Amino acid sequence: EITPDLWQEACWIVISSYFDEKGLVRQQLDSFDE
Numbered sequence: 001e002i003t004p005d006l007w008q009e010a011c012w013i014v015i016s017s018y019f020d021e022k023g024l025v026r027q028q029l030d031s032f033d034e
Contacts, residue, residue: 003010023029
């Protein structure tokens with residue numbers, strides 16, 4: 001359900017997940033592969 005006053009953990013969890021999927025140089029690699 002809703003996540004009140006737990007934002008300071010939820011937001012960083014989704015951000016950490018994002019950087020697990022996409023690295024820091026994905027724009028280099030994706031363009032060259034395409």
